[PDB]
Request: fold
Amino acid sequence: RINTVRGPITISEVGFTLTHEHICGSSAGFLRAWPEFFGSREALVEKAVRGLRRARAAGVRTIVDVSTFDLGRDVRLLAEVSRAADVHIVAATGVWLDPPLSIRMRSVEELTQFFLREIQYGIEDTGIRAGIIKVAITGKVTPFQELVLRAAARASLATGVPVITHTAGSQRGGEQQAAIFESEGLSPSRVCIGHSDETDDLSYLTALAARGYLIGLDRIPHSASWQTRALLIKALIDQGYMKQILVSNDWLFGISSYVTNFMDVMDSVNPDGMAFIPLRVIPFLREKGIPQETLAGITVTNPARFLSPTL
Amino acid sequence: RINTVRGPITISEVGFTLTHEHICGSSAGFLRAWPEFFGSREALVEKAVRGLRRARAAGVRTIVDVSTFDLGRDVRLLAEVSRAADVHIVAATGVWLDPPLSIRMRSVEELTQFFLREIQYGIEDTGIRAGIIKVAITGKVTPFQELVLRAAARASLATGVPVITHTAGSQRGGEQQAAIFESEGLSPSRVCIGHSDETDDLSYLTALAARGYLIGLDRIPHSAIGLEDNASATAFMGSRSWQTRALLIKALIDQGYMKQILVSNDWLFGISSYVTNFMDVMDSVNPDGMAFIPLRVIPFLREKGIPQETLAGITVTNPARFLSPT
Ligand SMILES: [Cl-]
Ligand SMILES: [Cl-]
Reply:
């Protein structure tokens, strides 16, 4: 079973899954301390519920909210929006690119215990348990980011929950992360190398897939061209790695961690929001001759295999 | 009137005040996300209540908790502890040295609105209103820190609530801060240059006091004398004795600036923003905690000949004039 913000669900209930999404990209405590930044908490909820309902009408049944503590994850917001929209949401532990001092002063052992707390006991006082570990790194893995990756590997090994990563400021970087994960004994089948659609180096992606890594082609609408990114899905299929592909939008319904009103810029480029993958990418792949069964394998079978805790 | 975490109080109820303290030094959301870092939330509460009750027995009536959003201020914690210790706690808005992206990407106008929300409306959904603005800078004021200082000045001028500062990694920064504050029209009498006991430069201290600034001599117990083999203690607490800090109080009194002095411990009952278990190091250095000032500094200054009326002026009259909005 897979833990969601409304409790455990069985694999058969997961359905069509977007594996790299957010409700809100923010900072810890910020939605509670300045909800007016987003108009109001009520306005953010209404926008997220409409957006998730739109995705649900296009076939989505589950999203993975990869927001960590330091990206302002508010699991009570996620639970409210999940219930209102009837879309499952998997919550995350881990560390993104803006850890406060109380996180970035910590050792690998301490970070391991924090991730384990959020997976095994629950997030804050809610009883909601994380179902994924998210780690972000920058170009050249910093000493702290290496501790995070090792703590994530150790928490995954103790719980079976998967790890999803990405590299900021670089079109590659999966090899750095893979070497650290493998040094810890982590299986590549527990790891998605995310934002992999930001490179055109197909031999780099094929080599990671051949080692058993999942390839996150999950920023498709952020080409602000999306068709070129989406053709990477067909190319990995043609190489025989359909089972290794995860697809998503990397979307959100509010954002405070960048410039003011960046949400408006994003919405203007991708008015489909979370429905961009099912409404645009899936029909595009079908028009290119990808069979429905292969598309269902990528959007349903692969995410369930990835998310199912597997020791 | 002065807003506290139990509601508003009159000047006469403020009493003996510690003007630069914290209940917990942390990060936003951290106490709620990982309370076991502090043993538990319940243990932290008990430790803070015991500590504040001991300060109260020694005469303390009010503390100013200068914890900001980004230092992990948890106003519900402050309220629980204020009520059980029966000690007034003034809460803070502002920005410390670890703003997350959602804060450090903001403009001076946005920061001003945030501070005004916490002073005029309330903190989070609690209705508890801040009674002071806390700002921290690093050596040379950074562009973002200048926005913080300007927004603090604008919020103080709109609300009458005072501003308290400190500089990290430099024993002097008040002259740079003061220039910015005065460029915004802020009266120096609404500003405390905090942690001014980090320097022995009397010329610097007296010139600020002569301009009407309050001088925060407010880290008095902090000293790593005897802990030379603990590099993290020396960096946090310094190599000067508590007596050396305290005699800056005498020195400003002797130069005629008794009314410009604010005194405190800069203590706390939990800390996660530094090295693990650093609370144990601080506690070994000053087992009296927040009671250090009334129990050890006040008698010390009496032994050096300062009249009791002068010490009462510094610990009661000055903080009340400072905190009262104007
Ligand atoms: Cl992310
Ligand atoms: Cl502080």
Notes: Chain A has one domain: 1-310. The first strand of chain A starts at residue 2 and ends at 4. The pocket of chloride ion (ligand 1) is lined by residues A 66, 96, 134, 136 (CB under 6 Å). The interface with chain B takes residues 26-30, 32-34, 36-37, 69-70, 72, 98, 100-103, 105-107, 110, 113-114, 117-118, 123-125, 256-260 of chain A (CB under 8 Å).
